[PDB]
Design an enzyme around this catalytic site. Structure first.
Site, PDB file in Angstrom:
ATOM      1  N   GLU A 142      28.670  -9.397  -8.470  1.00 26.54           N
ATOM      2  CA  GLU A 142      28.381  -7.964  -8.268  1.00 26.54           C
ATOM      3  C   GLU A 142      26.985  -7.592  -8.742  1.00 26.54           C
ATOM      4  O   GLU A 142      26.750  -7.519  -9.952  1.00 26.54           O
ATOM      5  CB  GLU A 142      29.346  -7.074  -9.030  1.00 26.54           C
ATOM      6  N   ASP A 177      29.061  -2.676  -4.547  1.00 26.07           N
ATOM      7  CA  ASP A 177      29.233  -1.352  -5.157  1.00 26.07           C
ATOM      8  C   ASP A 177      28.084  -0.475  -4.620  1.00 26.07           C
ATOM      9  O   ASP A 177      26.874  -0.736  -4.880  1.00 26.07           O
ATOM     10  CB  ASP A 177      29.245  -1.512  -6.681  1.00 26.07           C
ATOM     11  N   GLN A 203      32.915  -0.879  -3.735  1.00 24.33           N
ATOM     12  CA  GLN A 203      33.167   0.182  -4.694  1.00 24.33           C
ATOM     13  C   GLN A 203      32.281   1.377  -4.373  1.00 24.33           C
ATOM     14  O   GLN A 203      31.227   1.225  -3.735  1.00 24.33           O
ATOM     15  CB  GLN A 203      32.914  -0.289  -6.118  1.00 24.33           C
ATOM     16  N   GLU A 239      35.376   3.412  -8.581  1.00 25.70           N
ATOM     17  CA  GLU A 239      34.816   3.190  -9.887  1.00 25.70           C
ATOM     18  C   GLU A 239      33.833   4.325 -10.177  1.00 25.70           C
ATOM     19  O   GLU A 239      32.588   4.137 -10.167  1.00 25.70           O
ATOM     20  CB  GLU A 239      34.086   1.858  -9.940  1.00 25.70           C
TER      21      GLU A 239
HETATM   22 MN    MN Z   1      31.011  -1.705  -9.849  1.00 25.05          MN
END
Ligand code: MN
Length: 258
Positions: A142, A177, A203, A239
């Protein structure tokens, strides 16, 4: 329509962790994610999921000493046996929770030799891939951002795609994300399109303030339509830090619930 997973580390913090599973299910989430289950019995979390009809979509491998500022060790030369031992621990929980996707954190690597770090990343991700493949589990990298995680190993999306190609294992991918991608990279529609087939989890959170995805500089409904257009059928993790009370912020989710 995308399917959304409540993040129980950032959402529903009005109650203690174990109580968050019921609240997420009553709010109409079918899936959940969180960072670390390791301070709880795997059997207890498994029962939370079963009793509340929830899928465990994602969690992280052990990060090292979090209290001391550690943010993973996948890219830190010399911590390989530690990383390998942590894969076993993550796998134990992943099998208990029937979770198919794990995020392996890389660490703060500022001041270390970049080539050594990338080499160690490859070795560690290959080991994790090999240990997880028998169980159909995917390991993710990530990219973060340099404002929220200064000195973190990986903070750019296509750079992460490149690192994954070097790893050369089918059960390895990027965790996209969009909060981090918007802060560091931008050009999100074309980025998603370039990355198609290379991210296994997404995310969301508002930019810049990291709240509900109904405010800020991104038009999240459009981005949901992009994910659908490219054929993404994983989960979308929420998130974000709620503006106020978690449930008071859930109007954005109304069209998608259950
Ligand atoms: Mn994240």
């Amino acid at each position: 329509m995308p399917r959304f997973a409540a993040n129980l580390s950032t959402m529903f913090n009005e109650v203690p962790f174990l109580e968050r599973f019921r609240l997420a299910a009553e709010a109409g989430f079918g899936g959940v994610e969180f960072l670390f289950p390791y301070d709880f019995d795997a059997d207890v979390i498994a029962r939370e999921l079963k009793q509340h009809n929830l899928t465990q979509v994602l969690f992280n491998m052990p990060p090292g000493d979090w209290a001391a500022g550690e943010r993973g060790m996948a890219a830190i030369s010399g911590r390989e046996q530690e990383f390998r031992d942590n894969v076993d621990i993550a796998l134990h929980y992943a099998l208990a929770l029937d979770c198919r996707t794990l995020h392996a954190m890389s660490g703060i690597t500022e001041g270390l030799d970049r080539k050594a770090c990338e080499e160690t990343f490859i070795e560690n991700f290959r080991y994790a891939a090999d240990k997880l493949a028998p169980h159909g589990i995917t390991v993710l990298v990530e990219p973060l951002n340099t404002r929220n995680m200064p000195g973190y190993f990986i903070v750019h999306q296509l750079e992460a795609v490149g690192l994954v190609k070097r790893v050369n294992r089918p059960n390895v991918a990027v965790q996209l994300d969009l909060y981090h991608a918007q802060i560091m990279d931008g050009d999100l529609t074309r980025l998603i399109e370039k990355m198609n087939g290379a991210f296994s989890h997404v995310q969301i959170a508002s930019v810049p303030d990291r709240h509900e995805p109904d405010e800020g500089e991104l038009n999240y409904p459009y981005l949901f339509s992009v994910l659908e257009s490219v054929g993404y059928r994983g989960w979308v993790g929420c998130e974000y830090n709620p503006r106020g009370k978690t449930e008071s912020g859930l109007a954005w989710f109304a069209p998608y619930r259950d």
